[PDB]
C-alpha cells in the first residue's frame, strides 16, 4: 500500500493541521531549486512511487481517502468504503497509472469530467469565489464524498466537496501561504470564501514553477502577475520574496 | 429516458404503500437512482437512492421505514414505504441520475402523490 496520512476534523486544532500538512509535503518530497523543493519528475518515478494517500474522518465518523499524484500534489480520485472514483485522465499513461490504486475495492468509477477548477466550477454551480474553506466545510465535504458512494450525493454537491477538499489539502500542501489562510479560519472557528490572494495563486502555480525553474541566478526573466486580498495587482521578479509564500514546485525539465 | 410513478394514495397513520416507477429505456448504466418528496410549500428532498452497485443510502426521517429496491433488467425502481406518518405525505418523484459518471442526463418522473391522514 502507498503512505497514508491521517487527518479528522473531529477536535481539529492549528497544530493539528499544520502536522498534517508537514507530514503531507513530507510523503510528497531535500532536491530544492533556489531554496524551494521541487516534487518528483514523472519521467523515472517508479508507479510504487507515484502516489499517496491521504485518509479524512469527520465528526460523523466517516472516512473517505483521497489519492493525490506525487508529481504535482493533486487529487486523482478517492476511495470510499467498498468503492473508488477517479477524474476522467488526460491520457493512457495517466489511465494505465490510477489502475494501481485501490485495488481491493468492488466498484470502481471514472468520471466524465477531470479534476480541474474551471471544470469543477462549471458542476458545482459555483465559483472558488463562493464556496467556503475551513473546518466546517471539510466536514461537510468529507460526509458528501462518502454518501456519494451510497447514491445520497448530487453531483453539483459532489464537485463543490472536490472543490474544497483540493484547496484545503493540495493547494495547502503547495503553499504555505494557503495553508496559513487555513490556519487562521481553524484558529477563529470561521468558514469564508478564498479571496483574490488564493485564487491567484492557486491559478498561477505552475507558471511560479516554470518562472523559479528558469530563473537567472533566482531573477525572473519576466514578471509574474500576483493580486493582494484586495484584488490590485502586483508585479514579483525574485525568487526571494516567494520563499514564504510556495513550499513545493512541479519538477520542470 | 423517461419515467413513469405509479402506487400513490391515500393511506391512514401506520399504513403501507408501494412506489413503483418504470423507466422508458435501460437504467443499468445509470449511476444513481433515487426517490425524492416535496411537501406542500416545501424545496424537493432526497428520501432514498440506490446506485448501479447496489449500495443504498436514506434520509434519517425515513430509515427503517422505506426499503428502495432496483431491477437493472426490467427498469424499475421501487420505494416500499412502511409504518406512514402525516409527515410522510408529499408527491414522490423516482429520479434517474448518470451523476458525471459516463454522463450528466439527469431523468425525472411526473410525481405521485401520497396522502397520509385519518
Known amino acids: 500500500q502507498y503512505p497514508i496520512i491521517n487527518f479528522t476534523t473531529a477536535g481539529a486544532t492549528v497544530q493539528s493541521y499544520t502536522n498534517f500538512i508537514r507530514a503531507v509535503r513530507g510523503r510528497l518530497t531535500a532536491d530544492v531549486r533556489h531554496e524551494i523543493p521541487v516534487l518528483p519528475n514523472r519521467v523515472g518515478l517508479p508507479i510504487n512511487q507515484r502516489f499517496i494517500l491521504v485518509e479524512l474522518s469527520n465528526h460523523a465518523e466517516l472516512s473517505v481517502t483521497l489519492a493525490l499524484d506525487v508529481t504535482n500534489a493533486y487529487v486523482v480520485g478517492y476511495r470510499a468504503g467498498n468503492s473508488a472514483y477517479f477524474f476522467h485522465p488526460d491520457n493512457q499513461e495517466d489511465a494505465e497509472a490510477i489502475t494501481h490504486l485501490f485495488t481491493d475495492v468492488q466498484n470502481r468509477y471514472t468520471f466524465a469530467f477531470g479534476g480541474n477548477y474551471d471544470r469543477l466550477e462549471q458542476l458545482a454551480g459555483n465559483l472558488r469565489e463562493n464556496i467556503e474553506l475551513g473546518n466546517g466545510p471539510l466536514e461537510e465535504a468529507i460526509s458528501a464524498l462518502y454518501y456519494y458512494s451510497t447514491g445520497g450525493t448530487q453531483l453539483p454537491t459532489l464537485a463543490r466537496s472536490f472543490i474544497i477538499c483540493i484547496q484545503m489539502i493540495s493547494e495547502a500542501a503547495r503553499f504555505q501561504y494557503i495553508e496559513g489562510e487555513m490556519r487562521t479560519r481553524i484558529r477563529y472557528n470561521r468558514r469564508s470564501a478564498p479571496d483574490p490572494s488564493v485564487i491567484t495563486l492557486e491559478n498561477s502555480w505552475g507558471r511560479l514553477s516554470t518562472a523559479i525553474q528558469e530563473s537567472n541566478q533566482g531573477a525572473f526573466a519576466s514578471p509574474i502577475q500576483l493580486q493582494r486580498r484586495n484584488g490590485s495587482k502586483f508585479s514579483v521578479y525574485d525568487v526571494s520574496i516567494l520563499i514564504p509564500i510556495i513550499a513545493l514546485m512541479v519538477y520542470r525539465c | 429516458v423517461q419515467l413513469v410513478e405509479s402506487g400513490g394514495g391515500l393511506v391512514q397513520p401506520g399504513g403501507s404503500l408501494r412506489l413503483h416507477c418504470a423507466a422508458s429505456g435501460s437504467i443499468a448504466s445509470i449511476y444513481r437512482t433515487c426517490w425524492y418528496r416535496q411537501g406542500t410549500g416545501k424545496q424537493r428532498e432526497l428520501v432514498a437512492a440506490?446506485?448501479?452497485?447496489?449500495?443504498?443510502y436514506y434520509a434519517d426521517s425515513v430509515k427503517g421505514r422505506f426499503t428502495i429496491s432496483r431491477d437493472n433488467a426490467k427498469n424499475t425502481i421501487d420505494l416500499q414505504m412502511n409504518s406512514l406518518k402525516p409527515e410522510d405525505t408529499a408527491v414522490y418523484y423516482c429520479?434517474?441520475?448518470?451523476?458525471?459518471?459516463?454522463?450528466?442526463?439527469?431523468?425525472w418522473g411526473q410525481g405521485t402523490q401520497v396522502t397520509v391522514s385519518s
Open positions: 440506490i446506485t448501479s452497485g447496489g449500495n443504498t
Open positions: 429520479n434517474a441520475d448518470e451523476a458525471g459518471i459516463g454522463g450528466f442526463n439527469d431523468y
